[PDB]
C-alpha cells in the first residue's frame, strides 16, 4: 500500500469470489516481490513493458471493474518485470 502492491493485499482484492487455487498462476505474485531483484532502470523500464501486454486483462474481463484495479496496479509493479504474457493457440 505504501507503493508496491503486497500479495497478500492483492488477494483479499482478487478474492472476488471462492475460486480454485491456480498454483503454478501465483506466479504473477512473484512478480511483486521478485521485482525487488531487477535494480536500476532495466527494474522500473520492466515496468512499461507488460503494461501494454496487461491490457489483454481487460479484454478478458472487461465488464468487471476490477480490471481497472489489476490492469493499472499490475502495470506498475507486474510490469516492473516485463515477463510477457504467456500465449498459445487453442
Same mark, same amino acid.
Given at each position: ?18 475460486? %480454485?487455487?491456480?498454483?503454478?498462476? &501465483? ?7 521478485? $521485482?525487488?531483484? =531487477?535494480? !536500476? ?20 474481463? %472487461?465488464?468487471?471493474?476490477?480490471? &481497472? ?7 506498475? $509493479?507486474?510490469? =516492473?518485470? !516485463? ?8
Amino acid at each position: 500500500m505504501g507503493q508496491i502492491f503486497t500479495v497478500q493485499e492483492l488477494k483479499e482484492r482478487a478474492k472476488v469470489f471462492a475460486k %480454485p487455487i491456480g498454483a503454478s498462476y &501465483q506466479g504473477i505474485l512473484d512478480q511483486l516481490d521478485l $521485482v525487488h531483484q =531487477a535494480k !536500476g532502470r532495466d527494474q522500473i523500464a520492466a515496468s512499461f513493458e507488460l503494461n501494454k501486454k496487461i491490457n489483454d486483462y481487460i479484454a478478458e474481463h %472487461p465488464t468487471s471493474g476490477r480490471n &481497472q484495479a489489476l490492469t493499472q496496479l499490475k502495470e506498475q $509493479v507486474t510490469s =516492473a518485470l !516485463g515477463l510477457e504474457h504467456h500465449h498459445h493457440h487453442h
